[PDB]
Amino acid sequence: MDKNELVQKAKLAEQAERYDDMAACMKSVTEQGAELSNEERNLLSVAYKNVVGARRSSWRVVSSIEQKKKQQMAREYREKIETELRDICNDVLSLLEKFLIPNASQASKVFYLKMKGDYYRYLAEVAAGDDKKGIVDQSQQAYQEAFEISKKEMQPTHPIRLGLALNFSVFYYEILNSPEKACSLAKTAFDEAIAELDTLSEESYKDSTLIMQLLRDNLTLWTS
């Protein structure tokens, strides 16, 4: 199908909150092999974040219940939701590895690296045995790559740079049990954004300040 058709259909789905339809559109677009526009990048991001978001939410409820036929029912329901979660993550991580990251021609890089970090972090939330160590290392490596590029190429107020720090902070806190590092990374990103608030443009303003608020909320929670 035509890129333009798929993109218009994705935008319709987004408004309708039909994220499975939305992600199906954006998977097909990405698979055409051309670089995504900024608009298409956000479409992809929103669609997959809500598709996996649903499973994340459900998984947290059911595993909390498991932690309290029998307990078995919960366990089996948890495992089915897990399967779904992982297949969504595995799709995203395949799209990033097969198309998006290799053809990102601008500092796009990032994002897709951030995204790679996030979907591996979502796998790490649920990973149990053999492969968890590898999953967590992939998540760390992608975030670090993205982090290093972002420091070279973007102001400290740039929305994708702040969003990356935020998520990387959460990775350190939640996946790597590294609350010192999480707080230091959050605090630095926040303070550097403040110091250089004069660099924040009108078109980025609202997003960057919302992420700044989120950095501040986590820092509060982690020090509380």
Next chain:
Amino acid sequence: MDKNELVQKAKLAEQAERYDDMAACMKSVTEQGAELSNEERNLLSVAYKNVVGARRSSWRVVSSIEQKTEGAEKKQQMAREYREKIETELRDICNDVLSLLEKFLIPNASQAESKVFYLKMKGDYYRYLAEVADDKKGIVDQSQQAYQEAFEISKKEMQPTHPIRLGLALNFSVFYYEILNSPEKACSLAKTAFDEAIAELDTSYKDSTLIMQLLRDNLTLWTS
């Protein structure tokens, strides 16, 4: 076809907000032939109200988009076709529930409570078809006919403060207002239901105040 298993799973599905799963479970507590407790029918109702509710929400959104394209033919046609797809889902969900009501739930009802509950439910699911429907007259007539019978029964066999009684008056009044474009009748139906309940409350209980409050809220809307 496990029995109480299918119900505890319906309950897990509810807590997980996986309403498609929940509705498959409850539908099997129904396609068997046995009748339903107060709990199990509320489960059926919750599952299906959320399943149809998602299509209802999306359907309103794409129809609005289909009306607001600035004669953008290609955008409008794509919006029309998507609404048609959502419309098929929505109609199939209604048809399912109406099938369970017609073949299993209404025939096995017994107590007036349940007959009024199910007939109200039948009113509801035909109303939702009326929202999107040359088969319009007919769908609208089945809705009316089911609400009327439920109303007649409720008048004779239920206290005015009964929440099933109130919820039927509320939804029947909505049917008049929204589907039959009959504000005066809708207001008279809700006002009378409210008036009889409040008089009883000096002369059926936990949720009486909640539904009464929805009647008063609509009454405020319609008369301002």
Next chain:
Amino acid sequence: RRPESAPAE
């Protein structure tokens, strides 16, 4: 403005 209908009890 749409009216409110009954909740699923």
Next chain:
Amino acid sequence: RRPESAPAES
């Protein structure tokens, strides 16, 4: 008590 992460779009 779970922390916040970044919004989906930039």
